[PDB]
């Protein structure tokens, strides 16, 4: 019953740090819509000694304008209190992430056998206000067996404390740490490693290149690789050197480790271990998780102006970048900016072979040869009005246009 399905591969880097994370970036979150909701259901497919076991979670209705972190409302085949192991979080710009605590089994299995269970894939079901059913299939490229417990308490003994608190927004950590080294930028080899500890989770991040080697005046950007399931946005770091006495050499170190889950808990600890070679230094700081809604959940848009005369106006919807002619399914939807009734405002939907639905008022749509979609509006008044048009194809990228119609 999926109109459009998207495939993705989940890669595990190094080890499971205590939570599983998967990103779904292609579901539509329409702009200028307070009343736009989505029905989301998620199935996790587990392999248990070669036998397959499904786990269905119900996440109710997403309300992006009022809520950004969702706990499943009901589970089928789950172990008791399992619903507690899952979170659904909106990340902004039309994306969301699904998280599972991975140190407790979410399915009851025999103690004697089935002790090692592996996650095989995750299926995500998404139905928008137009009634279109979106599906995402994410397959575990390199899975490991889920190992319950294995959570020793870890603390580092000699690390200078910092009153700086690192805040996490939409799973992303952002902190800047002033520091001092005896080495000038020219004669410095800089390296840094981090560790984040809290609750049941232990994340390690390193520079895969080892060290910056020669440090340059100004900004020195570099990648960092963290243990766990990797986000499509890479984690990063920047070492900034001041411009050229007996005083030391000042630097600012900014770190942005990307997949950081609030399952760590408020007041978990970020450890930063760095070294400047011409020794060793360790800084520790607390980490807190913002509860603020991103308020930018809308998917990216393309805004364009159309000037008309009279009370009729036309607009041509181009093919999607990845879409080609003869694409098996093409869907185009449209609604006026800031609707207020879900029962009537979202009736204009066209497939390749459907025509204009009876419930669509003062808008006509038809596919021309070369697959350009032509929209006609016949009731435009004198005041400007904004039209939101969304087009998708089977293996292509969903694209949304904001079209402003203005009288000449």
């Amino acid at each position: 019953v999926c109109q459009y399905t998207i495939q993705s591969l989940i890669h595990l880097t190094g080890e499971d740090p205590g939570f599983f994370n998967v990103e779904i970036p292609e579901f539509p979150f329409y702009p200028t819509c307070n009343v736009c909701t989505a029905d989301v259901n998620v199935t996790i497919n587990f392999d248990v000694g070669g036998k397959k076991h499904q786990l269905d979670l119900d996440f109710g209705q997403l309300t992006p304008h009022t809520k950004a972190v969702y706990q499943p409302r009901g589970a089928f085949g789950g172990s008791e209190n399992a619903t507690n192991l899952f979170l659904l979080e909106l990340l902004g710009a039309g994306e969301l992430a699904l998280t599972m605590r991975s140190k407790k089994l979410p399915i009851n299995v025999t103690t004697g056998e089935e002790q090692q269970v592996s996650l095989e894939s995750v299926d995500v079901y998404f139905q928008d206000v137009f009634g279109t059913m979106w599906c995402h299939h994410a397959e575990m490229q390199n899975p490991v067996y889920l190992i319950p417990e294995t959570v020793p308490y870890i603390k580092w003994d000699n690390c200078n404390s910092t009153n700086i608190t690192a805040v996490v927004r939409a799973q992303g950590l952002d902190v800047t740490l002033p520091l001092s080294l005896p080495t000038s930028a020219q004669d410095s080899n800089f390296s840094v490693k981090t560790e984040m500890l809290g609750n049941e989770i232990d994340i390690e991040c390193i520079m895969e290149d080892g060290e910056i080697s020669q440090v340059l005046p100004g900004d020195n950007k570099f990648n960092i690789t963290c243990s766990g399931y990797e986000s499509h946005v890479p984690s990063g770091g920047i070492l900034t050197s001041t411009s050229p006495p007996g005083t030391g050499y000042a630097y600012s170190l900014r770190l942005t480790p990307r997949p950081v889950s609030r399952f760590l808990g408020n007041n978990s600890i970020l450890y930063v271990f760095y070294s400047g070679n011409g020794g060793d230094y360790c800084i520790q700081s607390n980490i807190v998780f913002s509860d603020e809604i991103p308020a930018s959940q809308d998917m990216p848009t393309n805004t364009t102006d159309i000037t008309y005369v009279g009370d009729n106006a036309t607009y041509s919807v181009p093919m999607v970048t990845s879409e080609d002619a003869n694409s098996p399914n093409v869907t185009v939807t449209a609604f006026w900016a800031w609707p207020n009734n879900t029962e009537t405002d979202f009736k204009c939907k066209w497939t390749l072979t459907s025509g204009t639905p009876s419930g669509c008022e003062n808008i006509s749509g038809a596919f021309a040869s070369n697959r350009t979609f032509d929209i006609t509006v016949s009731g435009l008044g004198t005041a400007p009005k904004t039209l939101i048009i969304t087009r998708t194809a089977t293996n292509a990228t969903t694209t949304t246009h904001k079209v402003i119609f203005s009288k000449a």
Partner: antibody
Amino acid sequence: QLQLQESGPGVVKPSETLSLTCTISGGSFSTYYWTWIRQPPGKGLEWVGYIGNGGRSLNYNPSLKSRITLSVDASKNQFSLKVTSVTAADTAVYYCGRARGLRGNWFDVWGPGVLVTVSS
Amino acid sequence: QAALTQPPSVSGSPGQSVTISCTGTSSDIGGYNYVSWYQQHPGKAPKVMIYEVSKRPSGVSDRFSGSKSGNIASLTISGLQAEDEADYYCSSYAGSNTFLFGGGTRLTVLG
């Protein structure tokens, strides 16, 4: 380029303490882990342990844990391994190495190895 | 020496592909992605061919590849050359900052 050099006594009397040091050149201890590996003549490899996080992490082979001590002397670019209560089962070539990557899983640079013989 | 399980020896002809298995448990090989493979020539220190299951250090040819399925890791050498004659060891993380090595496999190039 990083170069490592083990140095030991050659012969250790039974029940005495085996003391080895690795000297680092062309590099620094920095944020890496630093590990010891050993290989009895004609046999396979065995992981002894490693030291990391600026000496904050001391992790040893659980079968040798109570006889093993690792230490680092950054001012001499050396780190060391001590093995107590030695027997002929500890006769082996000992390697020091740099362990990099997450958890130090990647032993990318090795010393040439030093043979230590336990004999009365 | 507590160890992972490898066959004592494998053999191949020049130009052939040879695969070496390494069997662990859900607590070491199937529980992490920290499998390494080492090449050791007589009288020399081991040299890493593969780390993190399938990643190759700079300088080692792509004739060497690693994979994993379940608790079994495999090293494959294609385009076998007489230079490839050596002992091969697997290693894996085993939790709590510990590592286990395989017993080693002696590779013979025939002909």
